[PDB]
RNA sequence: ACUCUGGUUUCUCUUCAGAUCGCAUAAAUCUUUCGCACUAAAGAUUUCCGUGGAGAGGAACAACUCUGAGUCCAAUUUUUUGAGGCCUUGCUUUGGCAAGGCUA
């Protein structure tokens, strides 16, 4: 038990993620954890106005994870 | 549907719904050597799927051997495909289009039929006997067939209880088996990704005799159920191999610690199995309850009072539960029909994958044109009607639909072989009790009923009034070639029409069976071996044509062959003297015949690729290799037609106007042969020159082809010819104490023991030989009789060798009942063939020549 | 000790109103400890539950098939009747 | 394979000023230098300040304890 | 009533050890190829003779060789002869090497060889690589240990306490391959006369170098067995009336117990 | 083993839809139906609550924001 | 682990059994078969040699061993809450309903 999420196929691939509060980010998955904490290397968050701000590698928790969409071939 | 089916764990509606899905159907064939355990493994699968059907304590419930010949003879006769829904390791339920092919080397035709209606092959290897001749042949054929492969190891109970090797030695034997399988794979594979290993998840360890199927993932999941909170995938990734486990660090170390830690697999997989099998089979009465409590299984007083073997089977079935590991491995390796649609279309489907119809077929969309394909044609219980069997590459075949069943030669230019029929009342692919259905989605295996009228060997059912630009799926290419011939005639000639109707039916039934009537009126039917033809007769005289038929003595289909070069230039002229062709014969360079016959040198390629492959590999002149005309008798034929006409004397365009006729004549001649009316192999007929008239009325047409055949026969006769006979490789597996008797038996059949070697881990050696097929009739009975029933052997036509003597030798007498000596074989063979075929008893070098 | 409260409504047509406000009426053929329900022949209606509606009884009714209602958004459930033979 | 826990531990050991977004509330987040983290996602942020993107105001609170449920995403910042 | 005989594994092992002299000590039934009941039935039905087996009168009268006159499919001047097809090669493949094989029972193909290394010394362990078994030549992308593949402290093999060998383990594994009464562990007490202790000897191939009288006796015994087997009409459904129990119910009979010698002497006097 | 997790694991290989708590409905082939409600599809059509529909070559929604899932009930009978 | 119809042995009778009724094997009659039938085959029939299934009755000692049955989870991913409030539009069953935009 205590298996991690499906981050092996999406690891090292540029894809988008939806975070809570209406947040949208795009980056490469550098790894995942068992509590849904994933590492987004070279992450860029798209604001509601249209502009995107690059925040670099960040840690995303699994509670506010809405859905991930692979932007490349998996 | 208002049908009737035996009780099953799944639901018939659920099965139909799963079939409607396009990416969850497993099209697999359980290829495996003779008596490896394939049929018993399918029986275990059925027993899990069908609760009512259970195996008897002594006689195994062979639910995949429907035919009586397979029921009593013991060896599997034909493939009984089963389509059943079984769960997986994770829990998702798939459906499997299994096809339990037989293991006999003679019955390789059914295996070849199965692969064209499947996406992957599950090779079966017996643990005790390792790889065998049939196993290696099936591996080579499957890899050449471009299908996924998943080797599984069965009969582990033999190692655990009969052979009694220690667990470390058991792992050593298993690793050697896997290494040999991988090495054999790499000999013919193309992509390096085609690797097999328990670490890669493409290996299963089963025991059909006791239902002990498992794998790394499944058995790690068994630990997970027993312990909990264990990462089954990652842990199983460390459960196999040379790495040893270190209890002190609670981690698996690549370098073996403590100097006494066995491999991970032996430590965790083999040990428990050994312990449980030893407790069940050796100490049941004393320590049966404690071991059962430790393992968790509970058995009632009645269940624990069984015999040792059924009790062991029950305990193993309780311990391992369902065969989840096999399904998981098949899902992992063998792709879905939609995933594998493109490889199938590229390989077997004709007309090209890049074509529009090819693209539609590759899409594998049920809402598309119907382009199904039926490999095998099964027979009804009564033996009157035939039920074609195949898998739908596209569309959805439904009962009562009108279809256009394209035959085995329904080309695009000449659709004359098409027969517009009305398929109807089709069932699902069950083993012992078929289940009806209304439609058949693209991907499932459909047993149509009504399209059997034009379906002789193989056919592709299409959609009438549409798909006008369609092709017929490529005809099957069998592993080995049939060389045995047997004339058959009814005892009472009154019932001849019944016997010939039965012969047509049995020709339809057996894929590789070849039947014909020669100029002598004999009803010759071919066949791979000896037991093959015995089964053919036991079906012909007792199932289809209930009359009694008399079968002559078996023979071997000899083939012509030229040794020396052409004696002189043969000047053959067409009727009315409008054309005068000339051809010079020459034997083909060694290896080129086997390269063409293996489809390596494919004339289908363009001029550049064929020219390069001829100038480089065959060392042919860059100008000589650029004038090839045809490929002898067949598309893949051992003869090469070369346009050796000098341009200074012969116009290229004028020769091209007769090029088609010349190629057709050369093909007909190479199919016929000048010596014994047999196929001519290992020759290179080159047209030295030719005279061609202008008008097509005078030149070509119906005059060039007979002149071409005459010139070909004259060229193949002028050059010193020699008959050839099939030599069948025999791999006798006998105890090392009896290998001397095996060598002694093969001495009296003009055959040399090519290689003797012991089986790694098994006391029985595996002697390999090459006995000519002509004198190989009954060799199995002698080998198993001179050894008091302790040796079994098989056969397969490896190659052809020249007859010891000379065919055109009029100085050698013959005898009616005395076997001709070694030097007097070729002339005797030629004379007896020309007499049996009823042709003229004399074939002189000036028979078909122009001057006589 | 018994646990028959989930088995009494199992296999019968129940109409459950979740926390989102929709009412799913279908054959409750699946259950679990986390409140995950399985509705065979389930119809979801978000306008109003039709119970003797004079103007209309089906408003915004969508058929799903094998609907899987998660237990995280479950609020309450109501039994409508027994299941059919098929 | 860089996990999120190892990256959070490296950001806590580096003492860099990182910004964390509120879970279910993107209008206001926190920013500061976290000295260490806990097992329940609660970190001890030194010189933490609440920055609201709607009003463009920053209110500093000092050494704060950020719970793992209130913070949804955390990114790197230069200041 | 003595209807069930279910003994423990060591008891059956001791019984087999005390009776291994009369047992044929076979493993695979393939050693009786073309010498089984089906083979004998096929030989008798085909008017042929297996050299090691019996021969009976033909089931169907066979016409003479001259009855046919050089038919197109029977011309000797066309058949290529390499080896003479013996009666064994015809009884083995009846459908391919015998014209008109009416009522010819087929025989089972070779079952896989039972490669069971029989024990020879109790001192050696149970699962040991015996010298008879051919040695295995010891010549895997194993993942590195740098990961965190750590197992819980409670994870252990299922039978860590259970040994891989036992005193009765080797003996128990021996009884797997044995004559049928030894193979089973629970049986019904058959009648004394219904247990032939010498049938397996006759059924096997005759011992080498036996005199002509012994070979003829073996052939006659095989003929009697084949006759009793081919005529094995299943028994009919009786009403299950016991003549002995009926006479016991009759008031004109008493019951007692006496030695077989005394009863035999009394029976001899009564017969006189 | 739950009945819903077993139906999600056995629902792989066929077409099904999954609606989240925010109204995002992704319909397609359930490539991965994990026990933690993680639904991974390939070439899934995702329609949001506003009405805009798009296609994703590989989408993966976590089980924390799962509202409902409609799969084919033919495998249940 | 709470309780519960449920003991085996043995004797007798009836009835059914084409299952290798029996991991054994005989006898007799007829029929066809060549003789000129212990030394012979085939087909059938019948009686024994003695079984299994079920039922019924009886006397010995087990009363529930047995088995079948009636009987420790608050901190992500479901059940110990991102929880409550503001405005607009159509109907107001003037309670509020459905949707959209915000503070939390």
Curated annotation (Swiss-Prot), chain A:
It is found in: Cytoplasm, Cytosol; Nucleus. Its main location: cytoplasm. It comes from the Eukaryota. Keywords: Cytoplasm, mRNA processing, mRNA splicing, Nucleus, Ribonucleoprotein, RNA-binding, Spliceosome. SMART domains: Sm (SM00651). Signal peptide: none annotated. Pfam families: LSM (PF01423). GO terms for biological process: 7-methylguanosine cap hypermethylation; mRNA splicing, via spliceosome; RNA splicing; spliceosomal complex assembly; spliceosomal snRNP assembly; U2-type prespliceosome assembly. GO terms for cellular component: catalytic step 2 spliceosome; cytosol; methylosome; nucleoplasm; nucleus; P granule; precatalytic spliceosome; small nuclear ribonucleoprotein complex. Residues 2-74 form the Sm domain. Disulfide bonds: none annotated. CDD domains: Sm_G. InterPro entries: Lsm7/SmG-like, LSM_dom_sf, Sm, Sm_dom_euk/arc, Sm_G. Belongs to the snRNP Sm proteins family. Plays a role in pre-mRNA splicing as a core component of the spliceosomal U1, U2, U4 and U5 small nuclear ribonucleoproteins (snRNPs), the building blocks of the spliceosome. Component of both the pre-catalytic spliceosome B complex and activated spliceosome C complexes. As a component of the minor spliceosome, involved in the splicing of U12-type introns in pre-mRNAs. As part of the U7 snRNP it is involved in histone 3'-end processing. This is Small nuclear ribonucleoprotein G. It comes from Homo sapiens.
From Swiss-Prot, chain C:
Residues 1-83 form the Sm domain. It comes from the Eukaryota. It is found in: Cytoplasm, Cytosol; Nucleus. Changing residue 52 to S: In CCMS; expression of the protein is reduced. Methylated by PRMT5. Patients with the autoimmune disease systemic lupus erythematosus (SLE) have autoantibodies directed against some of the individual snRNP polypeptides. The most common autoantigen is called Sm. B/b' bear Sm epitopes. Belongs to the snRNP SmB/SmN family. Core component of the spliceosomal U1, U2, U4 and U5 small nuclear ribonucleoproteins (snRNPs), the building blocks of the spliceosome. Most spliceosomal snRNPs contain a common set of Sm proteins, SNRPB, SNRPD1, SNRPD2, SNRPD3, SNRPE, SNRPF and SNRPG that assemble in a heptameric protein ring on the Sm site of the small nuclear RNA to form the core snRNP. Component of the U1 snRNP. The U1 snRNP is composed of the U1 snRNA and the 7 core Sm proteins SNRPB, SNRPD1, SNRPD2, SNRPD3, SNRPE, SNRPF and SNRPG, and at least three U1 snRNP-specific proteins SNRNP70/U1-70K, SNRPA/U1-A and SNRPC/U1-C. It is linked to Cerebrocostomandibular syndrome: A syndrome characterized by severe micrognathia, rib defects ranging from a few dorsal rib segments to complete absence of ossification, and intellectual disability. This is Small nuclear ribonucleoprotein-associated proteins B and B'. It comes from Homo sapiens. The chain holds residues 4 to 89 of 240 of the full protein.
Curated annotation (Swiss-Prot), chain E:
The MPN (JAB/Mov34) domain mediates interaction with TSSC4 and SNRNP200. Has structural similarity with deubiquitinating enzymes, but lacks the residues that would bind the catalytic metal ion. Contains a region with structural similarity to reverse transcriptase, presenting the classical thumb, fingers and palm architecture, but lacks enzyme activity, since the essential metal-binding residues are not conserved. The gene is PRPF8. It comes from Homo sapiens. Part of the U5 snRNP complex. Component of the U4/U6-U5 tri-snRNP complex composed of the U4, U6 and U5 snRNAs and at least PRPF3, PRPF4, PRPF6, PRPF8, PRPF31, SNRNP200, TXNL4A, SNRNP40, DDX23, CD2BP2, PPIH, SNU13, EFTUD2, SART1 and USP39. Component of the U5.U4atac/U6atac snRNP complexes in U12-dependent spliceosomes. Within the minor spliceosome, which acts on U12-type introns, interacts with PPIL2 and RBM48. Core component of U2-type precatalytic, catalytic and postcatalytic spliceosomal complexes. Found in a mRNA splicing-dependent exon junction complex (EJC) with SRRM1. The chain holds residues 224 to 501 of 2335 of the full protein. Widely expressed. This is Pre-mRNA-processing-splicing factor 8. It is found in: Nucleus; Nucleus speckle.
UniProtKB/Swiss-Prot annotation, chain F:
The keyword RNA-binding applies. It is found in: Cytoplasm, Cytosol; Nucleus. Keywords: Acetylation, Cytoplasm, Methylation, mRNA processing, mRNA splicing, Nucleus, Repeat, Ribonucleoprotein, RNA-binding, Spliceosome. The keyword Zinc does not apply. Methylated on arginine residues by PRMT5 and PRMT7; probable asymmetric dimethylation which is required for assembly and biogenesis of snRNPs. Residues 3-75 form the Sm domain. One of its GO terms (biological process) is spliceosomal snRNP assembly. GO terms for molecular function: enzyme binding; histone pre-mRNA DCP binding; RNA binding; telomerase RNA binding; U7 snRNA binding. It comes from the Eukaryota. GO terms for cellular component: catalytic step 2 spliceosome; commitment complex; cytosol; methylosome; nuclear body; nucleoplasm; nucleus; pICln-Sm protein complex. Plays a role in pre-mRNA splicing as a core component of the spliceosomal U1, U2, U4 and U5 small nuclear ribonucleoproteins (snRNPs), the building blocks of the spliceosome. Component of both the pre-catalytic spliceosome B complex and activated spliceosome C complexes. As a component of the minor spliceosome, involved in the splicing of U12-type introns in pre-mRNAs. As part of the U7 snRNP it is involved in histone pre-mRNA 3'-end processing. In the autoimmune disease systemic lupus erythematosus, antinuclear antibodies are developed with Sm specificity. Belongs to the snRNP core protein family. This is Small nuclear ribonucleoprotein Sm D3.
């Amino acid at each position: 038990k205590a298996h991690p999420p499906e981050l092996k196929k999406f690891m090292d691939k540029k894809l988008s993620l939806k975070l809570n509060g209406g947040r949208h980010v795009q980056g490469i998955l550098r790894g995942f954890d068992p509590f849904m904490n994933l590492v987004i290397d070279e992450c860029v968050e798209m604001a509601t106005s249209g502009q995107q701000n690059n925040i670099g590698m960040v840690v995303i928790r699994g509670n506010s994870i809405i859905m991930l969409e692979a932007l490349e071939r998996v | 549907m208002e049908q009737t089916l035996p009780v099953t764990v799944y639901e018939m509606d659920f099965l139909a719904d799963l079939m409607d899905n396009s990416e969850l159907i497993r099209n697999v064939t359980l290829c495996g050597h003779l008596h490896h355990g394939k049929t018993c493994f399918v029986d275990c699968l059925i027993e899990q799927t069908h609760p009512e059907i259970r195996k008897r304590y002594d006689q195994d419930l062979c639910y995949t051997d429907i035919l009586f010949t397979e029921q009593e003879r013991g060896v599997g006769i034909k493939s009984t495909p089963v389509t059943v829904v079984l769960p997986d390791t994770k829990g998702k339920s798939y459906l499997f289009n299994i096809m339990d092919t037989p293991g006999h080397v003679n019955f390789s035709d059914e295996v070849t039929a199965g692969l064209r209606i499947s996406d992957g092959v599950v090779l079966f290897i017996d643990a005790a006997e390792g790889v065998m001749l049939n196993t290696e042949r099936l591996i080579k054929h499957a890899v050449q067939e471009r299908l996924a492969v998943t080797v599984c190891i069965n009969k582990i109970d033999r190692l655990i209880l009969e052979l009694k090797l220690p667990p470390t030695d058991a792992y050593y034997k298993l690793r050697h088996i896997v290494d040999e399988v991988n090495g054999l794979i790499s000999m013919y594979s193309t992509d390096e990704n085609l690797i097999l290993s328990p670490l890669l998840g493409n290996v299963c360890f089963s025991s059909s005799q006791y239902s002990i199927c498992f794998t790394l993932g499944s058995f790690a999941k068994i630990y997970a159920d027993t312990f909990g909170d264990i990462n089954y995938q990652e842990f199983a990734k460390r459960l196999w191999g040379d790495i040893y486990f270190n209890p002190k660090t609670r981690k698996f170390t690549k370098k073996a610690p403590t100097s006494s830690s066995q491999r991970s697999f032996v430590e965790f997989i083999l040990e428990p199995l050994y312990k449980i099998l030893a407790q069940v089979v050796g100490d049941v009465d004393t320590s049966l309850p404690r071991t059962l409590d430790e393992l968790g299984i509970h058995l009632t007083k009645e269940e624990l009072k069984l015999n040792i073997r059924p009790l062991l089977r029950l305990v193993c079935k309780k311990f391992f539960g369902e065969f989840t590991g096999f399904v998981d491995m098949c899902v992992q390796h063998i792709p879905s029909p939609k995933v594998g649609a493109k490889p199938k279309i590229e390989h077997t489907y004709t007309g090209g994958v890049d074509s529009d119809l090819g693209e539609a077929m590759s899409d594998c969309d049920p809402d598309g044109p119907l382009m199904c394909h039926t490999t095998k044609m099964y027979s009804t219980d009564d033996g009157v009607q035939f039920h074609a069997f195949g898998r739908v590459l596209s569309g959805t075949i439904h009962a009562g639909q009108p279809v256009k069943v394209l035959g085995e030669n329904y080309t695009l230019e000449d659709e004359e072989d098409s027969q517009i029929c009305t398929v109807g009342r089709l069932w699902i692919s069950v083993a012992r009790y078929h289940i009806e259905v209304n439609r058949v989605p693209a991907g499932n295996w459909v047993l149509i009923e009504g399209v059997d009228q034009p379906i002789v060997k193989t056919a592709t059912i299409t959609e009438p009034r549409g798909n006008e630009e369609a092709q017929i799926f490529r005809p099957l290419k069998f592993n080995t070639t049939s060389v045995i011939k047997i004339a058959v005639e009814p005892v009472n000639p009154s019932e001849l029409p019944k016997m010939l109707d039965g012969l047509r039916k049995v020709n339809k039934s057996y894929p590789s069976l070849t039947t014909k009537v020669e100029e002598s009126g004999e009803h010759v039917i071919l066949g791979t071996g000896e037991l093959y033809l015995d089964c053919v007769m036991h079906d012909l005289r007792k199932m289809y044509s209930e009359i009694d038929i008399k079968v002559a003595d078996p023979v071997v289909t000899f083939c012509e062959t030229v040794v020396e070069t052409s004696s002189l230039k043969c000047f053959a002229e067409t009727p009315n003297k409008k054309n005068k062709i000339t051809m010079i014969a020459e034997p083909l360079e060694k290896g080129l015949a086997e390269d063409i016959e293996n489809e390596v040198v494919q004339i289908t390629w363009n001029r550049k690729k064929l020219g390069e492959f001829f100038q480089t590999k065959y060392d042919w002149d860059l100008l000589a290799a650029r004038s090839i005309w045809a490929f002898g008798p067949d598309a893949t034929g051992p003869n090469i037609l070369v346009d050796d006409t000098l341009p200074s004397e012969v116009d290229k365009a004028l020769l091209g106007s007769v090029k088609d006729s010349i190629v057709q004549g050369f093909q007909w001649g190479t199919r016929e042969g000048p010596l014994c009316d047999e196929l001519i192999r290992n020759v290179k007929f080159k047209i030295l020159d030719a005279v061609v008239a202008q008008e097509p009325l005078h030149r070509g047409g119906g005059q060039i082809i007979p002149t071409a055949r005459r010139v070909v026969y004259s060229a193949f006769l002028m050059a010193t010819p020699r008959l050839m006979e099939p030599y069948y490789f025999v791999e006798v597996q006998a105890p090392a104490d009896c290998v001397s008797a095996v060598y002694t038996v093969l001495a009296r059949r003009r055959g040399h023991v090519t290689q003797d070697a012991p089986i790694p881990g098994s006391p029985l050696y595996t002697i390999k030989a090459f006995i000519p097929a002509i004198d190989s009739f009954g060799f199995e009975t002698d080998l198993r009789t001179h050894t008091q029933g302790q040796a079994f052997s098989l056969s397969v036509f490896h190659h052809w060798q020249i007859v010891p003597g000379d065919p055109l030798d009029k100085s050698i007498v013959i005898r009616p009942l005395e076997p001709q000596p070694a030097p007097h074989l070729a002339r005797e063979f030629m004379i007896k063939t020309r007499r049996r075929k009823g042709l003229s008893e004399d074939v002189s070098i000036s028979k078909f020549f122009d001057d006589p | 000790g018994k646990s028959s409260k989930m088995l009494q409504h199992i296999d019968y047509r129940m109409r459950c109103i979740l926390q989102d406000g929709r009412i799913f009426i279908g054959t409750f053929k699946a259950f679990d400890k986390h409140m995950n329900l399985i509705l065979c022949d389930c119809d979801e209606f978000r306008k109003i539950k039709p119970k003797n509606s004079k103007q209309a009884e089906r408003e915004e009714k969508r058929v799903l098939g094998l609907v899987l209602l998660r237990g995280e958004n479950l609020v309450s459930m109501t039994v409508e009747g027994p299941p059919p033979k098929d | 394979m860089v996990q999120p826990i190892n990256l959070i531990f490296r950001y806590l050991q580096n003492r860099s000023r990182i910004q964390v977004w509120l879970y279910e509330q993107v209008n206001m987040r926190i920013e500061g230098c976290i000295i260490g983290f806990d097992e329940y996602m609660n970190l001890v942020l030194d010189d933490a300040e609440e920055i609201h993107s709607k009003t463009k105001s920053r209110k500093q609170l000092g050494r704060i304890m950020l719970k793992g449920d209130n913070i949804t995403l955390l990114q790197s910042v230069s200041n | 009533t003595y209807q069930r005989w279910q003994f423990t594994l060591p008891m059956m092992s001791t019984l087999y050890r005390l009776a291994n002299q009369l047992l044929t000590d076979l493993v695979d039934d393939n050693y009786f190829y073309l010498f089984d009941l089906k083979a004998f039935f096929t030989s008798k039905a085909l008017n042929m003779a297996i050299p090691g087996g019996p021969k009976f009168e033909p089931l169907v009268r066979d016409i003479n060789l001259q009855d046919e006159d050089w038919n197109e499919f029977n011309d000797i001047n066309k058949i290529i002869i390499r080896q003479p097809i013996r009666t064994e090669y015809k009884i083995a493949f009846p459908y391919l090497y015998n014209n008109l094989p009416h009522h010819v029972h087929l025989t089972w193909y070779h079952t896989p060889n039972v490669v069971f290394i029989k024990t020879e010394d109790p001192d050696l362990p149970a699962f040991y690589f015996d010298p008879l078994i051919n040695p295995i030549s010891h010549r895997e992308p194993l993942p590195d240990d740098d990961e965190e593949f750590e197992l819980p402290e409670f994870v252990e093999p299922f039978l860590k306490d259970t040994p891989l060998y036992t005193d009765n383990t080797a003996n128990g594994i021996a009884l797997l391959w044995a004559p049928r009464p030894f193979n089973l562990r629970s049986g019904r007490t058959r009648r004394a006369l219904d247990i032939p202790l010498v049938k397996n000897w006759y059924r096997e191939h005759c011992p080498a170098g036996q005199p002509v009288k012994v070979r003829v006796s073996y052939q006659k015994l095989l003929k009697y067995y084949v006759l009793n087997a081919l005529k094995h009409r299943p028994p009919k459904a009786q009403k299950k009336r016991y003549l002995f129990r009926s006479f016991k119910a009759t008031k004109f009979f008493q019951s007692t117990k006496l030695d077989w010698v005394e009863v035999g002497l009394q029976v001899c006097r009564q017969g006189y | 083993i739950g009945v819903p997790i077993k139906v999600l694991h056995e629902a792989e290989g066929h077409i099904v839809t999954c609606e989240t708590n925010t109204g995002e409905v992704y319909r397609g082939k359930l490539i991965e139906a994990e026990d933690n409600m993680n639904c991974q599809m390939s070439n899934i059509t995702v329609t949001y609550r506003d009405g805009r529909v798009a296609q994703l070559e590989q989408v993966y929604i976590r089980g924390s924001k799962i509202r409902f899932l409609i799969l084919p009930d033919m495998l249940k009978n």
